[PDB]
Enzyme design. Structure first.
Site, mmCIF file in Angstrom:
data_model
loop_
_atom_site.group_PDB
_atom_site.id
_atom_site.type_symbol
_atom_site.label_atom_id
_atom_site.label_comp_id
_atom_site.label_asym_id
_atom_site.label_seq_id
_atom_site.Cartn_x
_atom_site.Cartn_y
_atom_site.Cartn_z
ATOM 1 N N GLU A 98 0.895 -1.156 0.000
ATOM 2 C CA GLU A 98 0.000 0.000 0.000
ATOM 3 C C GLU A 98 0.936 1.208 0.000
ATOM 4 O O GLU A 98 1.918 1.196 0.740
ATOM 5 C CB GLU A 98 -0.847 -0.014 1.279
ATOM 6 C CG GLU A 98 -1.834 1.133 1.416
ATOM 7 C CD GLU A 98 -2.831 0.957 2.567
ATOM 8 O OE1 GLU A 98 -2.677 0.011 3.384
ATOM 9 O OE2 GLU A 98 -3.773 1.776 2.665
ATOM 10 N N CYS A 124 3.603 -12.487 -15.909
ATOM 11 C CA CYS A 124 4.052 -11.848 -17.152
ATOM 12 C C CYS A 124 2.920 -11.433 -18.061
ATOM 13 O O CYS A 124 3.169 -10.829 -19.106
ATOM 14 C CB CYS A 124 5.073 -12.703 -17.891
ATOM 15 S SG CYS A 124 4.384 -14.258 -18.284
#
Lengths: 339, 345
Positions: A98, A124
């Site tokens: 965060e 990916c």
């Protein structure tokens, strides 16, 4: 059935990381430990086909690399940051849990109070997911322009992974699952997507398809310090999933292999790449490769390759370009760009 | 009379199921304070900053071996039962939690594999502080509207065990500065818990609630106000409050233009579950009836991006919500980002 008709690619850019570490240099500092386990082979340069990779300066974070990439993409699209209505960060590397890396990048750039931000995470495939999520907003008229960014850092994986394997104690089989971390590379890309009525001559993203096999969610598991991966099984089920995904791509995209001008794929190793081409009967000439000299840049690999192709004048107006990847999950995604 | 736009609002997107999970183990602010008392004394702290100031008397915790993915999955199962559908119907699954199993694969992958989604199921994560569940709601709303899927799961499991034991360990250090104490203090208002929502095209669930979506504004120049890794969160609660309210206010001007909002015409406000001062300042800033704002930080603390759906699910569980109720979802996440959306029950 229903493809995107008014989503374009307005600008594109990559950043090559500045320091080189050669698999030779790596192999020297690993020789003691190769000689313990009696492994004769050079798994990096001979088997994987990875001869170098790039690393960032000390303490360059993902958000820094994504910012440099995003700046260049903005210049490439010839629009200012006041135009960006959305910024999606797609990297594996993340400054924190965060807040989003996107918010950091956007703050560095000075985006407006209207710009939506968040991160997408999905191995990916994340850049293609990011591209698709942006395309959905563009088509709906939520935004006119979006940034999709991705900076990857492996500096820390290398410091720590090396020390672990070159200690006095060392393990046995972890070595083979750990070596995959020494195939990773630093790099960044960014893409400015846009509504087509704004950029009429630009390339177009049509979307595509996704299929999954999330039963194999164990096989590739990366922390910040460590990457554990079974590459052998990931390869086979990867290709099995890719095949399935190509059948889906026939039905929604109107695809065949002979028709496509470029295959832009996730870059892992010579064996992942060769198995892929062989299974699908692809002209190797339509498949640009960078792992040789950059290693595995995760989700930045695809847009890095597209940008490199662009910069070398490989992409003719009208070309049909397959964006595709096989990510951990397992997931597989395949999409079309018409240059 | 005069034909209007939709204002980019979502069409025929519905909420077909909703569920939460409360974490089993209670940790009282009294326990915490007893442990921190030598440090309170050393630092001259004579008030119960957790209980009296922050308004949190207890929070819940999992076992230490429990993962985000495990909680996300428990919740997902309960939401499926609520939606009365099997996992074979789910074409999209987004995990929106801050807590994450690994950097790769996605936590959605791990939830998806535990549930046994089809090979047509799309999976990825969305991370955006406490606003992510709403972001995931939007991303799934866009697909369902377009008719690319029938059903979506948005799932979110949070775990703060680790930040709790490490923060408590650092905050009881003989060397801990006042600055570092104050920086790390907000982490002791966090809480475990989880939530999941099944969303669907309205055609399939004609009496389910409608998700309209809404508006988003940002303030990315404040991205350093709150920052967290596995074991540590640092929080400028003062500037989060002030700049959070400013941003809320700006977003609300936009909510009037796109949602036609007005505080008196909304029946429920589902907000971020932070603290009693954050909540009071928000209610007072907009002139909202407190009874229209349900609160769970009192007993569960701040469950980050799960808080919104957990409050929604609990509102349903208590029978607060009736067909026709206009339900404001408003989130101010670290970033800063603020989304304001409407559910019509």
């Amino acid at each position: 059935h229903m493809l995107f008709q008014n989503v374009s690619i307005a600008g594109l850019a990559h950043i090559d990381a500045p320091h080189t570490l050669t698999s030779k240099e790596i192999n020297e500092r690993l020789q003691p430990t190769y000689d313990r386990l009696g492994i004769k082979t050079d798994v990096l340069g001979d088997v994987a086909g990875i001869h170098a990779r790039r690393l960032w300066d000390q303490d360059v974070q993902a958000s820094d690399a994504a910012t440099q990439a995003a700046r260049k993409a903005l210049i490439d699209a010839n629009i200012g940051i006041e135009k960006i209505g959305l910024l999606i960060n797609t990297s594996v590397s993340r400054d924190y849990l965060e807040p989003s890396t996107a918010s950091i990048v956007s703050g560095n750039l000075g985006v407006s109070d209207h710009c939506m931000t968040f991160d997408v995470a999905n191995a990916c495939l994340a850049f293609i997911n990011g591209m698709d999520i942006a395309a959905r907003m563009l088509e709906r008229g939520e935004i006119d322009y979006a940034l999709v960014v991705d900076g990857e850092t492996a500096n820390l994986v290398y410091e720590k992974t090396l020390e672990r394997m070159t200690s006095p104690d060392v393990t046995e089989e972890e070595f083979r699952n750990e070596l995959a971390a020494l195939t990773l590379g630093c790099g960044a890309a960014a893409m400015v997507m846009a509504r087509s009525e704004l950029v009429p001559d630009a390339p177009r993203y049509k979307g595509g398809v996704t299929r999954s096999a999330t039963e194999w969610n164990k096989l590739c598991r990366g922390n910040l310090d460590r990457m554990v991966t079974d590459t052998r099984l990931l390869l086979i089920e990867g290709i099995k999933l890719a095949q399935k995904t190509f059948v889906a791509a026939k039905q929604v995209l109107g695809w065949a292999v002979e028709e496509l001008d470029q295959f832009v794929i996730d870059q892992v190793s010579r064996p992942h790449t060769a198995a892929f081409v062989k299974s699908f009967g692809i002209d190797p000439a339509k498949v640009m490769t960078i792992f040789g000299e950059h290693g595995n840049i995760g989700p930045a690999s695809v847009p890095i390759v597209l940008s490199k192709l662009k910069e070398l004048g490989r992409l003719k107006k009208g070309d049909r370009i397959a964006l595709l990847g096989i990510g951990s999950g397992l997931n597989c995604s395949m999409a079309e760009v018409v240059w």
